[PDB]
Amino acid sequence: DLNHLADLYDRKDWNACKKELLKLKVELAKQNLFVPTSDKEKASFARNVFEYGVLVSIQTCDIESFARYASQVIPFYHDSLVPSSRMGLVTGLNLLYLLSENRIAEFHTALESVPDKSLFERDPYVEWVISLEQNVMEGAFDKVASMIRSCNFPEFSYFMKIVMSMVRNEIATCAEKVYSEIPLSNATSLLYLENTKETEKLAEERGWDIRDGVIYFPKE
Amino acid sequence: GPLGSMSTLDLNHLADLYDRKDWNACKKELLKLKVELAKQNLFVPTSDKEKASFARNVFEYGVLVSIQTCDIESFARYASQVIPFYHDSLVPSSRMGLVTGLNLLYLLSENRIAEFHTALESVPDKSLFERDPYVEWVISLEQNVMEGAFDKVASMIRSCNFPEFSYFMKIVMSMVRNEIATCAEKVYSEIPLSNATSLLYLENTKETEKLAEERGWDIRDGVIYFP
């Protein structure tokens, strides 16, 4: 059963989790359970293995494995099993993945494909990601930044940082064109960075010169 | 002449009228010439290069006269007629670079960016991209537009040495201006009205007020406040 995997996961023993996932996947292969089956007991077990795979993959920033497990788990959801306690988080993670890769059409297709639409308000993870996507698309970057700063879902950290980097590049790209200079403090606010040293790092990355606390944007 | 042994009909009078900038006379001459093209079955390109060149030349003058008289419908019509003559083996006229550039500039001005690039892929002699001043300038313009290089676009347009491109200059500037304004909205909370006019490459304080209204900005005490 999955009690032991749950324990390993709870202790954040990711290396043991991966070894247990291998053991369980070998069992799935022996029983022909990689693809969903009408036998709900066995389908649920397989689904649950792949859910832990999604979670262990994000915890170890293994995005290749994440995307493989995500593709394996979602087909189990598009049938009639009792959702596990992980379903909202996994659904949320998959949506946020698509957002982080700017796969916006695929994101909205994924929402359309969600059997029960009430999920969008009932489940806090899915609700949060839907709101983040709306705020990004509307260019409400204050709200994006506030949502990402105050996010209470640790599992979203990896992808949220990618989203925030995309927003920050877009702001940075506008700024370097419509300013000739800006003080470091103002730029730190503008870019939703935490402090001016963070801004100094971004300035170096982008080729901006800083002199006496003022950023000068490359021109003519 | 180009149409027939004893014919007195050729392009010399149109070429005179064009250099005189007598655009109304040019239009009347173009209609005369097109009537004769119809009588001779020369609207459609023919393997007879003498005749095809004559018909092509009429349509090229049509392109040029149409843009001089601010007439985009006629311009687009004539452009659609002339380009098929280019996709065969005539010796290019002195107008071919300018016409090709105008067609490209038109597609850019309408944000028909896919068609812009298809049109470049269609140009038989791709050395034209570097050799011809008109085509080279438009290619550079479109590149700077795509990359969002606002100040380069503005500077190219401000120093353009090709009067025949004048029609499209403010149109392309408005495309870029939109983008600048979207940027300014994102990264400013306020700016003096006068600094906004300069940032946006606008002509005066009043045009900025209209743009303000159009985009929903507020102005007070000579200052713009962004939503």
Curated annotation (Swiss-Prot), chain A:
This is 26S proteasome regulatory subunit rpn12. One of its GO terms (biological process) is proteasome-mediated ubiquitin-dependent protein catabolic process. Coiled coil: none annotated. The keyword Cell membrane does not apply. Belongs to the proteasome subunit S14 family. It comes from Schizosaccharomyces pombe (strain 972 / ATCC 24843). Keywords: Proteasome. Acts as a regulatory subunit of the 26S proteasome which is involved in the ATP-dependent degradation of ubiquitinated proteins. The chain holds residues 5 to 224 of 270 of the full protein. One of its GO terms (cellular component) is cytosol. Residues 61-220 form the PCI domain.
